[PDB]
Amino acid sequence: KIPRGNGPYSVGCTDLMFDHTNKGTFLRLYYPSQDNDRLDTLWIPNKEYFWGLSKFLGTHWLMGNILRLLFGSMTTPANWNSPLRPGEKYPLVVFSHGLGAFRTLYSAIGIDLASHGFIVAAVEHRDRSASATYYFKDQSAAEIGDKSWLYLRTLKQEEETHIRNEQVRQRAKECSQALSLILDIDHGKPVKNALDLKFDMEQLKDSIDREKIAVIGHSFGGATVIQTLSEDQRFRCGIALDAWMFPLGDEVYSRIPQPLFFINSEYFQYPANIIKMKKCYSPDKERKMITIRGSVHQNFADFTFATGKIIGHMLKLKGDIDSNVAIDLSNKASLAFLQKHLGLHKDFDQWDCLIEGDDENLIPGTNINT
Ligand SMILES: CCN(CC)CCN(C[C@]12C[C@](c3ccc(C(F)(F)F)cc3)(C1)C2)C(=O)Cn1c(SCc2ccc(F)cc2)nc(=O)c2c1C=CC2
Numbered sequence: 327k328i329p330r331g332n333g334p335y336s337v338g339c340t341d342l343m344f345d346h347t348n349k350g351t352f353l354r355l356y357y358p359s360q361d362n363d364r365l366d367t368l369w370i371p372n373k374e375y376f377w378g379l380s381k382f383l384g385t386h387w388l389m390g391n392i393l394r395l396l397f398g399s400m401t402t403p404a405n406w407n408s409p410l411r412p413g414e415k416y417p418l419v420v421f422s423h424g425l426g427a428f429r430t431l432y433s434a435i436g437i438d439l440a441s442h443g444f445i446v447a448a449v450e451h452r453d454r455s456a457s458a459t460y461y462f463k464d465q466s467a468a469e470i471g472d473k474s475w476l477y478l479r480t481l482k483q484e485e486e487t488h489i490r491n492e493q494v495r496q497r498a499k500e501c502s503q504a505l506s507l508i509l510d511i512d513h514g515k516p517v518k519n520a521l522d523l524k525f526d527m528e529q530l531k532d533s534i535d536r537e538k539i540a541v542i543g544h545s546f547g548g549a550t551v552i553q554t555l556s557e558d559q560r561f562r563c564g565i566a567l568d569a570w571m572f573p574l575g576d577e578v579y580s581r582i583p584q585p586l587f588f589i590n591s592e593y594f595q596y597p598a599n600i601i602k603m604k605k606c607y608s609p610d611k612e613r614k615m616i617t618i619r620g621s622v623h624q625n626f627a628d629f630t631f632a633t634g635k636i637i638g639h640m641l642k643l644k645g646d647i648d649s650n651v652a653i654d655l656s657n658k659a660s661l662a663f664l665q666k667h668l669g670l671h672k673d674f675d676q677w678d679c680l681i682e683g684d685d686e687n688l689i690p691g692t693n694i695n696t
Pocket residue numbers: 379382383384393423424425426427431544545546547570623624627628629641642
């Protein structure tokens with residue numbers, strides 16, 4: 327269902343939580359793998375994520391059990407806990423999920439990046455923007471595996487502006503903290519994974535190309551990309567996938583020195599949002615924008631592959647365009663942009679035309695009038 331990566335490398339996957347608290351880092355790692363004979367990765371790994379999704383969709387908790395029945399055994403094509411492919415320093419992408427999502431729902435992107443030689447750290451935010459997430463109250467709880475769950479916060483109309491901005495700021499701090507953790511692991515720092523999994527983090531020592539770091543994200547995660555870039559210069563460039571610009575404070579628009587690429591869906595965008603994207607532009611800064619023809623907001627997330635065409639188009643999970651075609655365009659254009667602004671010595675420049683929207687299923691810039 328969820329597509330395999332298009333690159334030459336097999337892909338592995340694991341989870342890392344450090345420290346064990348609600349202030350620690352929680353991420354799902356996708357990486358180039360040595361082996362390809364392991365069990366596939368469980369897509370949504372706990373029942374509480376389904377209860378969280380039901381609250382996010384506005385239905386009763388019992389609908390969560392129905393979602394669990396339909397999707398609870400589904401996997402994604404990544405070798406769970408497989409050894410890292412040795413003998414090469416890989417560039418790093420930190421990925422930020424949308425409102426109501428969590429770390430595991432962008433594996434199509436994560437797996438494809440990893441298949442082309444990236445390590446991808448998909449963060450799980452503890453700002454109450456995730457449908458659900460978990461942590462451990464103290465050291466004892468972590469030992470026995472007694473999880474404390476944190477669910478999505480519903481906002482009153484009056485809370486919107488202030489709380490969304492507090493959330494995007496926390497999200498940015500979580501992205502920076504995840505980077506610092508991965509870089510420390512790269513420089514041999516011993517870390518006790520709060521989750522007891524058969525993947526030794528010592529394998530990641532000397533595995534990261536420390537200057538080739540990017541941040542990518544969808545919707546609320548797209549705003550997170552921009553906030554993160556403005557406050558952490560260790561990130562060399564960013565790619566915002568159908569960014570939702572509402573959470574950003576007025577101050578961030580003029581302080582994004584890094585190259586920034588907006589990849590939009592045809593049907594999600596609107597003038598107020600496009601105007602905010604245009605405020606990030608300046609003659610001295612590198613900016614690109616493309617729109618995928620026939621695509622919808624959900625083409626960037628994994629649920630676009632989870633159902634058939636009829637049920638998909640009804641639930642707003644698919645657009646007029648084929649989902650595999652849409653994600654290939656976003657992923658290939660992303661690789662070209664990454665090679666250019668991280669200075670990679672790969673063949674991703676074969677997709678440079680996609681950065682300019684030069685393709686039958688792409689629109690240069692945007693279809694929205696402002
Ligand atoms: C309807 C409730 N309503 C108010 C909260 C709107 C909810 N909504 C549209 C939805 C996602 C939808 C969805 C999922 C999952 C099934 C399922 F049944 F297949 F599981 C069906 C139908 C429900 C389409 C969005 O919020 C869209 N959105 C997203 S969606 C990110 C996401 C979340 C969960 C996922 F499973 C996959 C992807 N991330 C953002 O950062 C922003 C926005 C809007 C502005 C900022």
